[PDB]
Amino acid sequence: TCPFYKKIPGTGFTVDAFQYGVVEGCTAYFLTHFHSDHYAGLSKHFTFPVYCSEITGNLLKNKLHVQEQYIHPLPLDTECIVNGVKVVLLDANHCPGAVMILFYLPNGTVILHTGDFRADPSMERSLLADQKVHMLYLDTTYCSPEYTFPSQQEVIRFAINTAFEAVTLNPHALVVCGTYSIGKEKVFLAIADVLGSKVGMSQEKYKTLQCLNIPEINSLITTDMCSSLVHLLPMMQINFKGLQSHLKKCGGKYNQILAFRPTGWTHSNKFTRIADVIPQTKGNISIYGIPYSEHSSYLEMKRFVQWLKPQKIIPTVNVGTWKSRSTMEKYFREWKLEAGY
Ligand SMILES: COc1ccc2c3c(cccc13)C(=O)N(O)C2=O
Ligand SMILES: COc1ccc2c3c(cccc13)C(=O)N(O)C2=O
Ligand code: NI
Ligand SMILES: [Zn+2]
């Protein structure tokens, strides 16, 4: 049962629809980015063409072992023709390799699928400025006004300052950052840079980062944990028990852990500004939850949609309940009446 919001009308295209078997009529499967809820179903035994960014294609080949004959990477900001239809991939400001897709239908309809994105004013000067867009398939993850969080710049500044202070006060403190999906790499890269260290991680995480075309990555990451003052761990280990366990394995090199858990929005945001964020502490371990989002805030999403002025909006997130659907449609109507389209 492939949902309608993953189908592109007038085409043989689906978007992020790999867990529904052979979709009837689908001649090309697009993947917006390498996140689990979006590539779900893709495996080494997929035998249909997959269209994606170069970075996403690297991850499909090396992490999911999809055969190269079915991986069709496309450059960004470049008009391409897929099965007789003009398409453009645009940077989504989400995770590495994440794209939005512009479809130019033969009948003149223009469709923008945002994939997952964090709307930014720089998108208002992309190839979208040249385009009337009739249908918008919109990442509505945080489509409610209570969803406020700081800029990525502000969050990284807090993380850098917090880590530099803690390690300058105690040179025997270890910094740990939690990760699961790709994305939010700036958190641990910026901290390692201010500490003059490479980032140590597992072989599997190292493999993943090697696929991301990050400039000078070999100067920034390592599998030699002993040489690193900043360690990556699975997000599930970012707790007092998991961190105590990791500290023991470091052989008495460290006597303190400062850990960061990059989250999306938490209602702590509704009460606390980034400068007033405090950690959870138990003994010699402190855990900071930092609101580093790679999705649009409500205000960022509203600004983007009011600039784009689409004729029709199709939400791709929070579609499962009538309450969420009615809430989002109320906001779309508000935005349209305020802006005048
Ligand atoms: C369990 O934590 C996640 C699982 C899946 C995803 C995800 C994302 C952000 C942040 C967290 C997650 C995301 O952007 N996407 O697409 C995902 O699939
Ligand atoms: C199972 O838990 C998730 C599955 C998918 C997603 C997700 C996210 C946050 C937090 C959790 C999840 C998210 O932001 N996005 O985009 C997702 O697709
Ligand atoms: Ni995502
Ligand atoms: Zn997602």
Residue numbers in the entry: 700 to 1040
Paper text:
Three human ‘MBL-fold’ DNA repair factors, SNM1A, SNM1B (Apollo) and SNM1C (Artemis) are involved in repair of ICLs and DSBs. SNM1A–C have conserved β-CASP and metallo-β-lactamase (MBL) domains. SNM1A/SNM1B are 5′–3′ exonucleases with the unusual capacity to hydrolyse DNA substrates containing lesions, including ICLs. SNM1A has a role in replication-coupled ICL repair, functioning with the endonuclease, XPF-ERCC1, to effectively “unhook” the ICL and allow downstream processing.
The electron density maps reveal both 1 and 2 bind directly to the metal ion(s) via oxygen atoms. Two molecules of 1 were observed in the SNM1A active site, each positioned to coordinate to M1 or M2 via two oxygen ligands giving an octahedral arrangement; precedent for an MBL fold inhibitor binding mode involving two molecules comes from the observation of binding of two rhodanine derived inhibitor molecules at the active site of a true MBL. The molecule of 1 bound to the M1 site is positioned to hydrogen bond with the main chain amide of D736 and to interact with the side chains of S735, Y879 and S800. The molecule of 1 bound to the M2 site is positioned to form a potential hydrogen bond with H994 and to make a water mediated contact with Y184. The aromatic rings of both molecules of 1 stack with each other in a staggered arrangement, with the ring–ring distances between the two 1 rings being 3.2–3.5 Å. The electron density map for the SNM1A: 1 complex revealed an apparent inconsistency between the ELF reported small molecule structure and the crystallographic data. The ELF report has the methoxy group of 1 at the meta-position, however, the electron density maps clearly imply that the methoxy substituent is in the para-position for both crystallographically observed molecules of 1. The obtained structures reveal both 1 and 2 (and, likely 3) bind directly to the active site metal ion(s) of SNM1A via two oxygen atoms and likely inhibit in a competitive manner with the DNA substrate, displacing the Zn(ii) ion complexed hydrolytic water/hydroxide that, in models of the reaction mechanism, is positioned for hydrolysis of the phosphodiester bond in the DNA backbone. The three rings of 1 and 3 likely contribute to their poor solubility and hence limit their usefulness as inhibitors. It is notable, however, that the SNM1A inhibitor 1, which we subsequently used as a positive control, also inhibits both SNM1B and SNM1C with IC50 values of 1.9 μM and 0.37 μM, respectively (ESI Fig. 7†), potentially enabling efforts to target these enzymes.
